[PDB]
Amino acid sequence: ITILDTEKSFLKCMRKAFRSGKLLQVGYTPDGKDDYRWCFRVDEVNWTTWNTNVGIINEDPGNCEGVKRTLSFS
Amino acid sequence: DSVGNTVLHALVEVADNTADNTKFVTSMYNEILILGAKLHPTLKLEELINKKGLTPLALAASSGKIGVLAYILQREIQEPECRHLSRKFTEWAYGPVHSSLYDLSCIDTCEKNSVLEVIAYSSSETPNRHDMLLVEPLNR
Amino acid sequence: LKLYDRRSIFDAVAQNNCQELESLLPFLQKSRKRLTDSEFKDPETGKTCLLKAMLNLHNGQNDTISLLLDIARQTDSLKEFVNASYTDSYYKGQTALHIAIERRNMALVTLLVENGADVQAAANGDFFKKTKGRPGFYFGELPLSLAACTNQLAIVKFLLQNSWQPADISAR
């Protein structure tokens, strides 16, 4: 509650409050256009499951200056 | 309907956080979206509005349907042609590690009926105000 | 004769259409071009077509990999690009072997080694570093450590007991 009431004390600017995710593209629409969407990141790990799950968005792993998208059924 | 609730607005409402419901509703909630994608791939069913203003997610968080609120946020549709609907996407996954991208479109204080605006400011009559905020993205 | 540029490789190698990657070897041998050259790399990160093949390894069944490995063998120059290190800071040392270990492909490990892949390839970088901020899987920045920390005991035993290049168990 304190967080939200505090955000409202900032009128509409949100400039340091759009809550990182920076319009990271995560695929394409089901017609061809881009799908930029705000997305909070989360890092995880699973040792039993090995995360061959389809849906990878970035061939080269990581997060730096320079992102490169995957053949996610373009 | 007379209240304006659609199919999805009902599936949220009919649940009561029990196991069988939650096992059930999330599944039917899955399929109809897959169908509504395959049939009419423009209808944003999760963005339609009942007469009270609340979207399905908004209704879920409002009335306090934790199991549904889990699914709607941390879904993942592997099925191609209907991946746009998913939220818990996975970016880079170097073996055991995998970095995920819990979507935020309707759960940050930018939209009118954001869940987090609803969950906190709502009445105490809504059961499980607390346990909703222990879902994975909202907590962190 | 059709000319043949790097962007059409990186796309087509991911598509896994060897038919497209057919008039290369005439073109390559004609034009004096080599598969290891500033044309056929990445301007920023540094790469090889081989890497891009290994990344887009759908179903564990990229066969274009065997295609272009045979090609440079005809161009009497294999060693340079099989031991191709990303020349980034975030990535510095990553080879095809490090990825084939990541992707659980005994066969692709076998092939690269038989072709003459190095097994003391150091992945000293940042993603591969211990940094308590920027995350990343820390193994020993060295292949068999990656196989060791990744449940690929078969690939461990191969890198150690193979004939072409036995792995140093006591790397640093």
For residues C3 and C39, the answer to whether their CB atoms sit within 8 Å is no
Q: Which amino acid is it at C43?
A: P
Handedness of CA C102, C104, C105, C109 (dihedral sign): positive
Please indicate whether, in this complex, the C-beta atoms of A4 and B102 are within 8 angstroms of each other.
no
Question: How many angstroms is the resolution?
Answer: 3.8
As separate numbers, helices (DSSP H) first and strands (DSSP E) second, chain C gives 9, 0
- For residue B47, list chain A residues with Cβ-Cβ distance below 8 A: none
Task: Report CB contact under 8 Å: A57, B89.
Answer: yes
User: Which ranges constitute the DSSP H helices of chain C?
Assistant: 6-15, 24-30, 49-55, 64-74, 79-82, 96-102, 106-115, 143-148, 153-161
Write out the two tokens for B14: 């009919």
The DSSP output letter for A35 is: E
User: Is-contact A38 B104, C-beta < 8 A?
Assistant: yes
| Helix or strand (DSSP H, E) at B70 | helix B66-73
- What count of Cα atoms within 13 Å lies in the side-chain half-sphere of residue C67? 20
Of A17, A27, A41, the CB nearest to B83: A27
Whether C127 sits inside 8 A of A61 (CB atoms) is yes
Q: What is the CA radius of gyration of chain B?
A: 15
> Quick check: B100 and B89 in contact, CB under 8 A?
yes
Cα B105 to its chain centre, rounded Å, is 11
Tallying the residues shown for chain B, one arrives at 140
Quote the CA–CA distance of B78 and B93 in Å, as a whole number.
Answer: 16
Closest CA–CA distance from residue C66 to any residue of chain B (Å): 24
Q: Is the dihedral of CA B110, B115, B120, B123 positive or negative?
A: positive
Interface test with A, best of C13, C48, C127 (most A CBs within 10 A): C127
Consecutive H or E run containing A28: strand A24-28
Other beta carbons within 10 Å of A60: 23
| CA–CA separation, C83 and C72 (whole Å) | 13
Q: Identify the residue among C52, C87, C90, C128 best suited for mutation to test binding to A, counting A beta carbons within 10 A and taking the highest.
A: C90
Amino acid at B80: P
Method: cryo-EM
How far is residue A74 CA from its own chain's centroid? 18
- The C-alpha atoms of residue C2 and residue A21 are separated, in whole angstroms, by 43
Torsion over CA: B13, B19, B22, B25 (sign): negative
Contacts of B52 (CB under 8 A, 6+ apart): B3, B4
SS3 of A65, please? Answer: coil
Q: Which residues contact C134 (CB under 8 A, 6 or more apart)?
A: A62, A63, C126, C127
- Chain C hits for A63, CB-CB cut-off 8 Å, are 134
Per-residue DSSP letters for B23-41? HHHHHHHHHHHHHHHHH-T
Pick C135's closest partner by Cβ from A43, A70, A71. A43
Cα distances from C146 to residues A45, B129, C119, C151, in angstroms, run 16, 45, 11, 9
Distances (CA, A) of B79 to A51, A69, B57, B73: 16, 19, 22, 17
C7: left (phi over 0), alpha (psi -120 to 50) or beta: alpha
Strand (E) or helix (H) holding B121: helix B115-121
Token code pair at residue C100: 């084939």
C-alpha dist (Å) from residue C24 to B55, C38, C39, C80? 55, 17, 14, 19
C53/C67 Cα distance (integer angstroms): 11
The span from the CA of C106 to the CA of C101, in Å, is 8
For chains A and C, what is the number of CB pairs under 8 angstroms?
27
- Are residues B69 and B135 in contact, defined by beta-carbon separation less than 8 angstroms? yes
Contact B94 C102 (CB under 8 A): yes
Give Cα separations from C119 to C101, C147, C158, C162 (angstroms).
11, 11, 11, 11
Nearest alpha-carbon partner for B104 in C106, C167, A38? A38
Angle between helices B19-39 and B66-73 (to 10 degrees): 40
CA dist C107 and C52 (Å) reads 17
CB B78 within 8 A of CB A45: no
From A73, A62, A59, select the one nearest C47 (Cα to Cα): A59
Give the contacts of B123 (CB within 8 A, at least 6 positions apart). Answer: none
State the burial class of residue C152 (Cβ atoms within 10 Å of its Cβ: 0-12, 13-18, 19+): buried
- Portion 98-157 of C in contact with A at CB < 8 A: 104, 127, 134-136, 151
Cα–Cα distance measured from residue C159 to residue C110, given in angstroms and rounded to the nearest whole number: 9
**Which residues in chain C are immediately followed by a break of C to N over 2.5 Å?**
none
CB atoms within 10 A of CB B139: 8
How far is Cα B53 from Cα B61, in angstroms, rounded to an integer?
A: 13
Hey, are the CB atoms on B104 and A8 less than 8 Å from each other?
no
Please judge whether A62 and C14 are an interchain contact, meaning their C-beta atoms are less than 8 angstroms apart: no
> Which chain B residue has its CA at the smallest distance from A62's CA?
B92
In which element (H, E) is residue B136 found?
Answer: helix B136-139
Residues in contact with C73: Cβ distance below 8 Å, sequence separation at least 6, in sequence order: C115
